[PDB]
Amino acid sequence: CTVQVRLELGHRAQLRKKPTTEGFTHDWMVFVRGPEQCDIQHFVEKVVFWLHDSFPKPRRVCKEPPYKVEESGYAGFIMPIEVHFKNKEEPRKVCFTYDLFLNLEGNPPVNHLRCEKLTFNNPTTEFRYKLLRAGGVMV
């Protein structure tokens, strides 16, 4: 059997009224979540967000919801995001390369969503139940 689950990755960015002491222009927030009335914590062990090289402790881990990072910056960057599963077999995780882009001065805030369907072929019984408890569907 095959079980499909959905993830939503997203981000919001806007200009700060007042730049930080480093002079960062923007606040941003990146997240991983499930669709409404779904609970991805049943099958997700943790989410790791890899911030820009410039950050202190760039490896940011969320072991429970909300799976989100909120920071300030001057520029967008490519953000590796790892979603680790409560699985004993492969795949143990999925990796996304997320386009964290900011609004150019003048332009309204950014509020984006990237929807990902995961297809698990022949998951173990134990993991199958986690996917289905999260609101996954047999296909």
UniProtKB/Swiss-Prot annotation:
Residues the UniProt record annotates as site (Acylated histone binding): D99
Annotated YEATS domain residues: 1-134
Region described as Acylated histone binding: 52-54, 74-76
Location of the protein in the cell: Nucleus
Function: Chromatin reader component of the super elongation complex (SEC), a complex required to increase the catalytic rate of RNA polymerase II transcription by suppressing transient pausing by the polymerase at multiple sites along the DNA. Specifically recognizes and binds acetylated and crotonylated histones, with a preference for histones that are crotonylated. Has a slightly higher affinity for binding histone H3 crotonylated at 'Lys-27' (H3K27cr) than 'Lys-20' (H3K9cr20).
Disorder: A chromosomal aberration involving MLLT1 is associated with acute leukemias. Translocation t(11;19)(q23;p13.3) with KMT2A/MLL1. The result is a rogue activator protein.
Subunit annotation: Component of the super elongation complex (SEC), at least composed of EAF1, EAF2, CDK9, MLLT3/AF9, AFF (AFF1 or AFF4), the P-TEFb complex and ELL (ELL, ELL2 or ELL3). Interacts with ALKBH4. Component of a SWI/SNF-like EBAFb complex, at least composed of SMARCA4/BRG1/BAF190A, SMARCB1/BAF47/SNF5, ACTL6A/BAF53A, SMARCE1/BAF57, SMARCD1/BAF60A, SMARCD2/BAF60B, SMARCC1/BAF155, SMARCC2/BAF170, ARID1B/BAF250B, MLLT1/ENL and actin.
Domain notes: The YEATS domain specifically recognizes and binds acylated histones, with a preference for histones that are crotonylated.
Protein name: Protein ENL
Upper taxonomic lineage: Eukaryota, Metazoa, Chordata, Craniata, Vertebrata
Gene: MLLT1
